[PDB]
Write an enzyme that holds these catalytic residues in place. Structure first.
Site, PDB file in Angstrom:
ATOM      1  CG  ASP B  15      -1.799   1.114   1.415  1.00  0.00           C
ATOM      2  OD1 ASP B  15      -2.357   1.561   0.384  1.00  0.00           O
ATOM      3  OD2 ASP B  15      -2.041   1.533   2.553  1.00  0.00           O
ATOM      4  CG  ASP B  17      -2.026   7.719   0.528  1.00  0.00           C
ATOM      5  OD1 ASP B  17      -1.096   8.536   0.450  1.00  0.00           O
ATOM      6  OD2 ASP B  17      -2.943   7.585  -0.332  1.00  0.00           O
ATOM      7  CG  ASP B 150      -2.945   2.698   6.217  1.00  0.00           C
ATOM      8  OD1 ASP B 150      -2.968   2.447   5.018  1.00  0.00           O
ATOM      9  OD2 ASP B 150      -3.204   3.843   6.673  1.00  0.00           O
TER      10      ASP B 150
HETATM   11 MG    MG Z   1      -3.205   3.217   3.152  1.00  0.00          MG
END
Ligand code: MG
Ligand code: K
Ligand code: K
Ligand code: MG
EC number: 3.1.3.-
Lengths: 201, 201
Positions: B15, B17, B150
């Protein structure tokens, strides 16, 4: 339309350049306008996926000139839809148990192309359709039942993609003999619903 | 590094961000600079994935102000890398039988975000790494062995994704209890090679 909770819709990846957007015609028009004193390749005489390679064989430095057309601002945004493409994909996306994603590869120069592809989808399909875009150089890592794409050779990091690749006819591929049981969608007027239905439970 | 012809490399989706790029810290800095007279949420007090929702509960109209930070030019491009992220992903990509893709969702406003994500990858990983980017709102249709991300809830059109989602710790998720056998990568200093190796043949 999505399946009912946790259920399984048919998933179709629809390519952009050569399937939704007329890259070949847009290129040729803008090439001839910018470089009127250079030779060019009529669409009927296009052979092989890479436009710049055929141009580079035609005359020294013509590959770089060709590239400069699709690297230019507004090239992607101004592409015309193929006949029937917008209408077919709208219909397809509205079908029961059918999820449609637009699966498209950007060019190497990224200043305009990603942005303009999103803008073009918003233009023809509306803001909510932006959720269906997958931008990737490697389509083999995208899982689906079908990939409708004009590129004959679709390879990448996944040696056994989940999709069946149905070759969408384009000027550069129309004479190609495919290994059985590979198949074609000849245009959006051709029977794309039968192809989808052949993959359903 | 790719597997030998037709062979099978471990595939890892990383991922962007919250895993490579410090969205939360960049947001907070720019929010406080632009809106110095507004209240804000310290990183330690962040709860839930959607920043704008927590801001919108803090004071009327603050959701829209928050959104205006990440819709602004240069927001994505200027994000700082997380500690250890660039170094870990470079190492990871160099490993035998290991293919790494950066799998990232753009925001809804597309003027800058796609472009700046490509530019940011070029900046920290080099031009050749651009081939490893997959931009998609739906990560469930991307096939891999692992997704390091996240976001706690990663859903989409594929009810049974091929990847195992390993939750990357971020301020907004650090207190979350996960259902066994879900697991975490706590930071890039944590033992990411052991996680990869657990999925190898
Ligand atoms: Mg993310
Ligand atoms: K193929
Ligand atoms: K998840
Ligand atoms: Mg194409």
């Amino acid at each position: 339309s999505n399946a009912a909770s946790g259920g399984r819709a048919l998933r179709v990846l629809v390519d952009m350049d050569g399937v939704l957007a007329d890259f070949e015609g847009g290129f040729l028009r803008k090439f001839r306008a910018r470089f009127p004193d250079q030779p060019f390749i009529a669409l009927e005489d296009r052979r092989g996926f890479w436009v710049s390679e055929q141009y580079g064989r035609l005359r020294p430095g013509l590959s770089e000139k060709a590239i400069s057309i699709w690297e230019s601002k507004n090239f992607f945004f101004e592409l015309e839809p193929l006949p029937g493409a917008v209408e077919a994909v709208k219909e397809m996306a509205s079908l029961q148990n059918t999820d449609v994603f637009i699966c498209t590869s950007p060019i190497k120069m990224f200043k305009y192309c990603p942005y303009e592809k999103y803008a073009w989808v918003e233009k023809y399909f509306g803001p909510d359709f932006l959720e269906q875009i997958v931008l990737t150089r490697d389509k083999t890592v995208v899982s689906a039942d079908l990939l409708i794409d004009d590129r004959p050779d679709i390879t990448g990091a996944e040696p056994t993609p989940s999709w069946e690749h149905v070759l969408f006819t384009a000027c550069h591929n129309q004479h190609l003999q495919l290994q059985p049981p590979r198949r074609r969608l000849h245009s959006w007027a051709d029977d794309w619903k039968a192809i989808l239905d052949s993959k359903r439970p």
